[PDB]
Amino acid sequence: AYGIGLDITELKRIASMAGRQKRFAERILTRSELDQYYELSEARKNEFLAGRFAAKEAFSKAFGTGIGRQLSFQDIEIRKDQNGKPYIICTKLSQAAVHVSITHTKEYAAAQVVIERL
Amino acid sequence: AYGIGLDITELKRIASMAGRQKRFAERILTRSELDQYYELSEARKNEFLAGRFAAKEAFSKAFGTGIGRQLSFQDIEIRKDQNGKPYIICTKLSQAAVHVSITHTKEYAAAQVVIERL
Amino acid sequence: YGIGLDITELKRIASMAGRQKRFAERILTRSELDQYYELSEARKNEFLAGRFAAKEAFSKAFGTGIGRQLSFQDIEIRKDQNGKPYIICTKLSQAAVHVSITHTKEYAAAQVVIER
Amino acid sequence: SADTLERVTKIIVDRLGVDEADVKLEASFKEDLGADXLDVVELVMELEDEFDMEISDEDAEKIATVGDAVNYIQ
Amino acid sequence: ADTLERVTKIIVDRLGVDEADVKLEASFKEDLGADXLDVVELVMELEDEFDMEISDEDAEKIATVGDAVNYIQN
Amino acid sequence: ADTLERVTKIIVDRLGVDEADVKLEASFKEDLGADXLDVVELVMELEDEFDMEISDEDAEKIATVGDAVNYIQ
Numbered sequence A, B: 001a002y003g004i005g006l007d008i009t010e011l012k013r014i015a016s017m018a019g020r021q022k023r024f025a026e027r028i029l030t031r032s033e034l035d036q037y038y039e040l041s042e043a044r045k046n047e048f049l050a051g052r053f054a055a056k057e058a059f060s061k062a063f064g065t066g067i068g069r070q071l072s073f074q075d076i077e078i079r080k081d082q083n084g085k086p087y088i089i090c091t092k093l094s095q096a097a098v099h100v101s102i103t104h105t106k107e108y109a110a111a112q113v114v115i116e117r118l
Numbered sequence C: 001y002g003i004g005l006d007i008t009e010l011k012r013i014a015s016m017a018g019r020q021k022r023f024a025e026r027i028l029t030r031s032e033l034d035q036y037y038e039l040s041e042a043r044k045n046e047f048l049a050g051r052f053a054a055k056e057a058f059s060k061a062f063g064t065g066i067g068r069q070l071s072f073q074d075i076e077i078r079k080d081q082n083g084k085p086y087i088i089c090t091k092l093s094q095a096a097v098h099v100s101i102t103h104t105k106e107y108a109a110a111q112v113v114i115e116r
Numbered sequence D: 001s002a003d004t005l006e007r008v009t010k011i012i013v014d015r016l017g018v019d020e021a022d023v024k025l026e027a028s029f030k031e032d033l034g035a036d037x038l039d040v041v042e043l044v045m046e047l048e049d050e051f052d053m054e055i056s057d058e059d060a061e062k063i064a065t066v067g068d069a070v071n072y073i074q
Numbered sequence E: 001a002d003t004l005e006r007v008t009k010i011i012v013d014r015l016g017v018d019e020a021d022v023k024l025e026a027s028f029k030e031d032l033g034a035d036x037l038d039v040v041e042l043v044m045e046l047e048d049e050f051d052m053e054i055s056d057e058d059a060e061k062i063a064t065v066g067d068a069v070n071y072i073q074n
Numbered sequence F: 001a002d003t004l005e006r007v008t009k010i011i012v013d014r015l016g017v018d019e020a021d022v023k024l025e026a027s028f029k030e031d032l033g034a035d036x037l038d039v040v041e042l043v044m045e046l047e048d049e050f051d052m053e054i055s056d057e058d059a060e061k062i063a064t065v066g067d068a069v070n071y072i073q
């Protein structure tokens, strides 16, 4: 559906995984996102993970269905272009344009998503 | 779009104010929003109040004038739809679509609004 | 057409001791400096964190970030009589811009939408 | 009155960042006294209480300065 | 029956919600204060504790504690 | 390089990291975790220390430490 989404996620909540962050990463990331994650340092893993969870929560908000039957975390992938600008490729999105922006503070990951008419 | 707006509100600040001033919520919320607020626990209350305040501040910015002479808190109402997502009905709007997204962390409530065509 | 969002911690921007002035010269245009000098201490840190957030949001929206393709000096934020901010940026019109800026005790945040 | 002014300065100082030697009739709340939106609505509520009155969001916008409030409290 | 004891412990240990507040009709999000991130850790907790896997499709299908129990027991 | 010695002292005070952390091939963003704000405060400190001018573009080129050392020479 056409909509917008906003999501702010506290870094500490993702960092507080320790022995659960691998399973959580696998539930949250696609194949290529996971490869990037395994290549990162531990502080960088939490940031990467919180940014992706925020971007995907925001996207599902704009998509208007939330995560579930119509949309799985695995159907959404954030990629970066040559300039490091993030974009979303989604397997369930039909004839529409998607916009995303991700930002970080020391304690937070925030993302906003716009799904528009082509 | 015709206008956009963003607002982040501190939950503790809202909590102290409502503690200090029992009519703060009556000023911010419509009667319908207000009845909804009353059905909630002490926790759920400050975040519901902070979220609606954020959504109204953001809307008033998207609307272009902020809250005041051209627009009251009372003219903006946040409603839940079929599945629960928030949307806005504003007495001063007639030929624009309005989009809102509301998010929450442990300390902050945040919302964004887009007012646009069709 | 793209969107940009940025959230900057206020402490870090006020925290710039004698280093904050040179920082303002880098982030602000001439018309924005004049305004910044004429301000109080607290209002100064806020004015600066918002301009930084706004310019970063706009730069993300534009798709390049700050650098070769776009400079802070190319972005100017002004406010009308209703206090609504708007961006001027003669870096290729053919597009309308929308901006919103907000402040909290800890943070300065901004969003931008650049459309077709 | 000149009474209403002392009751308004007390309320401002208590509420905002302001000292006591800055509540000069011309001082704008948002501009000069470091007030944001949540600060002024609280400020408005103090006044509604301290002078048994009702101040709409419309009237809130009229009282932009210290002198504005006073005049309004008459 | 036994499954509710374990399920409840999970809920209590995660969402930290009083206890004795874990009713079969109790909605995780609406009645227990769970955001989206809390419900995903909850589901993961359930996946370990019972050695099962819960898809995103299935995670949506289970709103209440009773829904959790029923899902688990069959 | 006393240049590096001077570059590291600046980095261990604007970013807070330890020391061995600051290697020559260390990335400002990935290994030191400096964001867009950290990066400009970092570039301004270098402007100060070594007395030079780093344009908005110049700064987007100094990817790691070694690069910054090279630009300073």
Ligand code: NA
Pocket: A103, A104, A105, C006, C007, C008
């Ligand atoms: Na940021």
